Symmetry: D2
Subunit: 90 residues, 4 copies
């Protein structure tokens, strides 16, 4: 958990780096297509971060499944599926 | 499994209907923005179909982890996460 | 316009082929991850089709702005941008 | 241009705010679904920012179209279409 946490924070540090980069590009009147390229890179990084958190969550649901009971499993999977739907709509 | 199969087939019949609709739109020189609106409708229906299949599979995976114990179903979680990543690009 | 129309129709024939393929996959109880891979392939082909239509329309819009002058085609730009936004959600 | 610039910077300030929020959530071991919700909000904001820059760019291509010539119009539209494709793949 500690290793995964450190890795998540490092991914978000990178992303905030990208967003600071975007501000500097806008400030410096950088050609809009070059900015769009960096926007797409930042969105991709966020998506990759989201998938890593989802995978870790699903792994936990697997680890704990025998303790939870059918109702709680169904509710966790319904919730994850909804989060996946919201992710898909970006 | 048999009811879900019927429901999967009905979704796909409607999607094929939408694609035939796109064909007729193109054939009839319909304004391209209206055509794009229908492309969005079709991709949305495909994504909704994907999410239904995903929910059912993830339900099976976690239920199977409860019945069998251990974390071997983690392989299936990783495979699902890769599938979601592919959906997210497209 | 006639050649582009032919090329639009051929893209859509192939997409309908893919959807019939999904139907047979479901009908034959194919493993759901393989089915998702084909859903991704179909959504990707739809997006590629959308981008072709968009390129052609934006070419027309800018060429028409050159021939006529002024900025009245800005309405068409806003309408296109809204179409792209809809595609991006789906 | 100055008003659009200020508006772009304000949008990116908001987004960096969101990313700082994500770091705090991870730091505080916030439930992963709540984090995913905020990831999706941040990706959506980036997409909305990208669309605003694209619209502004297309408006400029319209304003300048009579000065540019057919070759340069085609190249600008091809480039925008590619950027739109890259946007779609997030």
């Amino acid at each position: 958990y500690h290793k995964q946490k450190a890795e998540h924070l490092k991914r978000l540090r990178r992303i905030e780096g990208q967003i600071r980069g975007l501000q500097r590009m806008v400030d410096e009147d950088v050609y809009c297509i070059d900015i769009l390229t960096q926007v797409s890179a930042s969105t991709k990084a966020l998506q990759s971060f989201a998938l890593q958190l989802l995978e870790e969550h699903l792994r936990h649901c697997v680890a704990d499944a025998a303790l939870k009971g059918g109702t709680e499993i169904d509710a966790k999977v319904e919730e994850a599926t909804k989060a996946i739907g919201r992710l898909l709509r970006t």
